[PDB]
Amino acid sequence: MRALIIVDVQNDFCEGGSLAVTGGAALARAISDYLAEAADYHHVVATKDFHIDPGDHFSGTPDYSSSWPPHCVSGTPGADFHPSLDTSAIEAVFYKGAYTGAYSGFEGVDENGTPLLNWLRQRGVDEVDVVGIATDHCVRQTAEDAVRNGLATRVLVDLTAGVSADTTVAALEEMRTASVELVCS
Ligand SMILES: [Fe+2]
């Protein structure tokens, strides 16, 4: 009935990465050891940005709004899980963005055909907690898609890392107005 969804906790989104979010490395290890304390999840899954050829999504002259420097490229280290981050508990991985810019974990597919919402409902999951990077981008988008698709949804705000303070505030407010619950873990 309840699952935890770990969003985009990848090398390119941590310190050193092409799209470094300050606090990313620290956040990977805070999520491990949670997982070790509580817990209380019927299931645990992760999502990954994973680009083979997404076209205009990448640019040499990026605007950090619709075009980005190359990141999470298939066959490079940027695309892998940050090495903090116990992977033991993770039952399935959902990849999105192979040929396209992706905005939400709900665009991800696992290694057989399977889209995220399908995998969850087949297991009778009806409520989700969301954690990961970035609060103001893919976390926000994944949380509001969870609610659009009929799931009861929390974000564990202490277990997210956002890009900027001003945009993180705007994002937390839009999440409440969409009816996501914002709590500490
Ligand atoms: Fe991307």
Author numbering: 1 to 185
Pull verbatim passages from the article behind this deposition.
PZA, which is a prodrug devoid of significant antibacterial activity, is metabolized into its active form, pyrazinoic acid (POA), by the amidase activity of the Mycobacterium tuberculosis nicotinamidase/pyrazinamidase (referred to as MtPncA), encoded by the pncA gene. The structure of PncA is made of a six-stranded parallel beta-sheet with helices packed on either side to form an α/β single domain. The substrate binding cavity in MtPncA is a small crevice of approximately 10 Å deep and 7 Å wide, which is delineated on one side by a catalytic triad made of residues Lys96 at the end of strand β3, Asp8 at the end of strand β1 and Cys138 at the N-ter extremity of helice α3.
The crystal structure of PncA was determined to 2.2 Å resolution by molecular replacement using PhPncA as search model. The asymmetric unit contained a single protein molecule. The metal ion present in PncA was finally identified by ICP-MS analysis, showing that MtPncA contained iron at a concentration of 180 µM for a total protein concentration of 260 µM in the assay. A final refinement considering Fe2+ as the ion present in PncA showed that the iron atom was coordinated in a distorted tetragonal bipyramidal arrangement by (i) the side chains of residues His51, His71 and two water molecules, HOH220 and 221 in equatorial position, and (ii) the side chains of Asp49 and His57 in axial position. Thus, our results are rather in agreement with the previous report of Zhang et al. who found that the M. tuberculosis pyrazinamidase contains iron and manganese with a molar ratio 1∶1, as opposed to what was speculated from the study of the pyrazinamidase of P. horikoshii which hypothesized that the metal ion present in PncA is a zinc playing a direct catalytic role by promoting a hydroxyl ion involved in hydrolysis of the drug. The latter assumption seems to be definitively ruled out considering the fact that the metal ion in MtPncA is located too far from the active site cysteine residue (Cys138) to be capable to contribute directly to PZA hydrolysis through the activation of a water molecule. Strikingly, and as opposed to previous observations made in PhPncA and AbPncA, the side chain of the key catalytic residue Cys138 in MtPncA was observed to be oriented not toward the centre of the binding cavity but, instead, toward the side chain of Lys96. The second striking structural feature observed in MtPncA corresponds to the very peculiar conformation of the 51–71 loop forming a protrusion that occludes the mouth of the binding cavity. Notably, His51 and His71 correspond to the hinge of the loop encompassing residues 52 to 70.
